């Protein structure tokens, strides 16, 4: 039966002393011909066993349905990826990785640009 389980068992949600936040990976601004491929490898410093990636553009939540379906956003166990596939100009834009946890929240963007390759 499809059952997510893991609990948020939360208790160092701002008294964390010590450990580090979830602080994410510079992304690199790629620019890059109409019906190329561009990767977004976005992680923390440190590995966690509680780190909810999100991908945004514009401030706007890429979620499956807002994610244009070039795209292919890939949730690894303790990172993220954001595969752009067939990238064209409809893709030129900032896009956000977001890290949520207990420890905290960070973002790194990623300034996408594509051009007609004439």
């Given at each position: 039966?499809?059952?997510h389980h893991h609990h948020s068992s939360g208790r160092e949600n701002l008294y964390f002393q010590?450990?580090?936040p979830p602080r994410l990976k510079e992304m690199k601004s790629?620019?890059?011909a109409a019906g190329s491929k561009l990767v977004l490898r976005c992680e923390t410093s440190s590995e966690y066993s509680s780190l909810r990636f999100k991908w945004f553009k514009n401030g706007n939540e890429l979620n499956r349905k807002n994610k244009p379906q070039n795209i292919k956003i890939q949730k690894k166990p303790?990172?993220?990826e954001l595969r752009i596939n067939k990238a064209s100009?409809?893709?030129s834009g900032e896009y956000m990785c977001k890290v949520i946890s207990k420890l905290g929240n960070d973002?790194?963007?990623a300034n996408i640009t594509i051009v007609e390759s004439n």
């Open positions: 039966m499809h059952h010590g450990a580090l790629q620019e890059s303790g990172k993220s100009l409809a893709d973002s790194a963007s």
